Each structure stands twice: as C-alpha cells, then as structure tokens.
Automatic annotation (TrEMBL):
Keywords: 4Fe-4S, Iron, Iron-sulfur, Metal-binding. The keyword 4Fe-4S applies. [4Fe-4S] cluster 1 binds at C41, E43, C102. This is DUF523 domain-containing protein. [4Fe-4S] cluster 2 binds at C41, C102.
Amino acid sequence: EKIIVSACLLGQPVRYDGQSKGIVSNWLDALGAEGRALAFCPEVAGGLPTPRPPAERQGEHVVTESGLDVTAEFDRGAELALGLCLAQGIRFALLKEGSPSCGSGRIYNGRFEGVSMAGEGKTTALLRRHGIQVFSEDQLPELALALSLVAT
Ligand code: SF4
Ligand SMILES: [Cl-]
Ligand SMILES: [Cl-]
C-alpha cells in the first residue's frame, strides 16, 4: 500500500547543499496525492543539519573529507527509516541513487575524488537486510509494478 521515499526526491530542500532532487513523475505525484508516499530523510532524521558537509562511506564508517565521523547519525537515520517501515507496514522504498544513506546501486568510493563504485548507502543496506525492497529513481517502472502487483 504505502512506500517510503527519500525526501529530496519529493522536492524537499534537505540535501547536503540545501538543494532538492525533485523528480518529474505523474505516477509519484498520484501516489503522493493518495497519501501513500511517505517522505523521509535519514540524514536529517539522524540529527544532521542542512546544509552539511559532503560525506562518503569508508566501509561501515561514514566520514566527511575532514575526517569527522558521522556514522552515529547515519546509523540512527537508517534505524528510524526501518522503524517507520515497520510501524506503517511498508515493504518498498524509493531512495536517492549515489547517496551514502540512500544509494542502492552505486555510492562514492570513500576517497573524495568524484569516483563512484557499485554499492549501497547505510539506509538501503539496513532496509534490504530486513526484507524491504529498495528501488532508485532510475527504477520507477519496476517499483510501480511491484506496488501494483499487490493492489487487489
Ligand atoms: S539522506 Fe537521502 S533523502 Fe536525505 S537528502 Fe540525502 S539522498 Fe535525499
Ligand atoms: Cl549533487
Ligand atoms: Cl548523485
């Protein structure tokens, strides 16, 4: 029935630079109009401000370029995303690609050099570990299908 969605994909200005990543989708707009797309930002939920410095995963740690360790906030935001899914009975997530929290197919490599690698963010990894299917904004058709199959 409902899905959890990265708040930036819904146009909320919660990105590290205060920007949004609002996607153009008639389907996502309709889902939101029905009260079925729950906005959530793991980094803001975890206690990080907006704006905030860029961060990259370095294995299980998440750090900024200056070496500040923000894993505590990233892990809290991931656990709150899981908590919202369990409370609302959500089995699907639409999360922002490339993010150290929301990435699902790729993330930055931890070297702060603009290089991506195959991998997932901290929130995606925890949701997948608990049986929640995570799709990126590049997989809207697949997500829409997965949600429609259980409708009747
Ligand atoms: S943590 Fe996820 S939802 Fe929040 S701004 Fe970053 S990519 Fe978007
Ligand atoms: Cl960006
Ligand atoms: Cl990106």
